[model samples]
Target chain A: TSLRDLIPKHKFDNSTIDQLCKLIDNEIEPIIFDLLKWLQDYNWPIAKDILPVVVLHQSIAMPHILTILQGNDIMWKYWVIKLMIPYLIYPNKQLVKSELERLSSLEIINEDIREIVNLSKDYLHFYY
Target chain B: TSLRDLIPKHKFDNSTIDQLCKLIDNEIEPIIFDLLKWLQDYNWPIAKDILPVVVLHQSIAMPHILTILQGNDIMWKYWVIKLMIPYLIYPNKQLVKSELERLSSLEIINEDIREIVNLSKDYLHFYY
Candidate 1:
């Protein structure tokens, strides 16, 4: 059976095939931009099958997500900042700082983002 | 002279009025749904004055946020789940378990949520 055929067969079960699909989607597919687009468009119904890919694409996709969060709608922007928090806690301090600097340049600074910036400063203050 | 006029003037300063506004918005206004609707409709310009309210209304508003996260976009939903994590770590295990059970019933358990549920189980396991 083709990969597409295998997708549905293992949809409900956490079988080896499903685990393989998740690993491929997370670690490998994200590095290939075109393949990532295609998979995103594929719109697989299984969230378990898809979350790893999303997290793996964090470095590539987060900047755009941050840009969208520049809007002044505090409610929505707060949620976005909250979503980005875990990514900030990653070991890569430079990338985290770069993202914060980018966000600081934006016209609107919502309370949550401000909190993030403050936290980032604190993190770096202690880290360095 | 009015509340609206006071808002713009106090927008930049973290003054007493702003703090009071934040307290009223967070603690008092959310309990009154119609008042919340009116405030949401008012299109307030200050987010610093708004976040406290959001954090306060969390118990009341989180269910609707969870419903929105029921969508299957792994990237988006993963972000939502991440945002909800800190809230789950709050003192209330019953609320956390009920939310976990609700998400489990949806058949959309991503790895992050599974990790969260596991963490919740461990938390309860230790607490009880």
Candidate 2:
């Protein structure tokens, strides 16, 4: 009759689907952040359907994402990077800048990963 | 008497443990790769103890490390990155190169992770 976590096993979208939209209207932070992990887990089958709505509200939610990015958990850190790709324009400058500067003096050498950091800096030059 | 996988549960190092050294003398691949995970799992209470011996025999097993790097599992890929940091000089260039290239075109923005990729490239510039 009803599913557990994540999926909003709510009312019929037929007449009240707008209410679903209304429910998440102000909760961009929790919904998007929660969906971030759901998608990260490769559960896009169900979670991907929520993307359009998340994207619609992403700008409002994006800035707050650093709670995970700045954490010591390497697992979430990688996912945070992957999650931030689309929102590169709105990243927390201090957050990304600090980590980048710290590692710049070290020995990073992945070509694929290098360009990504480069892309961010390049964007941040003016960075929308 | 069996402790389970990994540990050999062998004799006294001063007396007959030379026999234990003889056991892993040829199979350097298994110990380092296995210990790599043990350490990654944060089981350092037990695994850290294995590190000296693994590091001692790493070169013998290092070449085969690409199996995990090249794997589809993102989890192992990160661990492989961390594990390889110690032996960047001996990485399988073609392997690291391809992944780095693939991720570069789209996005990746982790500086901590980026320098790691960089460290490898700088070394591959000579890569002892």
Candidate 3:
């Protein structure tokens, strides 16, 4: 099956939650790249849109998701800044602090995502 | 061209914000339907992603945006439930307060979005 086409067109209510998680699990890399393209290149609105579901699948994909992104500059920045939301939602302050510190070290991205990066850390530390 | 075809596939940095805003402006109805389908039916991760940019263009489309959603039950539940983020980011507590009151009346959504809906109002009132 073609994961690329199925993923972006994924329906929430039409399909069960487990169904979407399986789709993301099967094509995690391409899906990650698809998320990256939206994150790094354009359409972060879309990037931000798709990420919550992706976060739900983090247990399955986080291994490779983090592995594929480890020490990589831009993807890591996008991933972690957005990572705060899931952490905040589910309450994973441990990972939040770790990733925020790593993000602080990178300092590679600029502009709006940078603001999110800073705000993600600040908000988490302040509130959590 | 089919608005449905282009919208879910939209890319961000590759296009200007004005370009996206124009797309929403041109196909506002189908776009609203499309957004409603996602919000009410499926793919709210994707729905959540697209809305931020949609909110950015609220100035251009807010009239129709609010007009179409007026008195809507499920769709308004989805929309106002999700709208708190933009208001928080942009700082529109007045609208936030009014909408939260409206949302308190709806109580239409259940489960996850309901949590977001409830938390959205609570968080805004408590923090904002």
TM-score of every candidate = 0.27, 0.30, 0.36
- Evaluate model 2 with DockQ and give the value: 0.01
lDDT of 1 by residue, B22-114 (tens): 333235443333222222312233332333333334445555445544544444333334333343213222344554455544443577666
| Highest-TM-score candidate | 3
- Can you give the DockQ of every candidate in the order shown? 0.02, 0.01, 0.03
Using DockQ as the measure, the top candidate is: 3
Top candidate when judged by lDDT against the true structure: 3
Q: Residue A36 of candidate 1: its Cα lDDT?
A: 25
lDDT of 2 by residue, B9-117 (tens): 3321123212323344365454555545544432334332343344334445455455665555554555555444333212223345665444334234776456545
Looking at model 3 chain B, report the run of 10 residues with the lowest lDDT sum.
Answer: B84-93
- Docking quality class, candidate 1: incorrect
Ranking by DockQ: 3, 1, 2
lDDT of 2 by residue, A53-103 (tens): 333344455554555545544444444444343333222323466554433
Tell me chain A's TM-score in each of the predictions: 0.34, 0.45, 0.49
In candidate 3, how many Å is residue B45 off?
25
Clashes (backbone N, CA, C under 3 Å), per candidate, total: 1, 14, 8
Candidate 2, superposed: residue stretches over 4 Å from native: A1-128, B1-4, B8-25, B30-32, B88-106, B109-128
Question: Once all C-alphas are superposed, what RMSD does model 1 give against the true structure?
Answer: 18.0
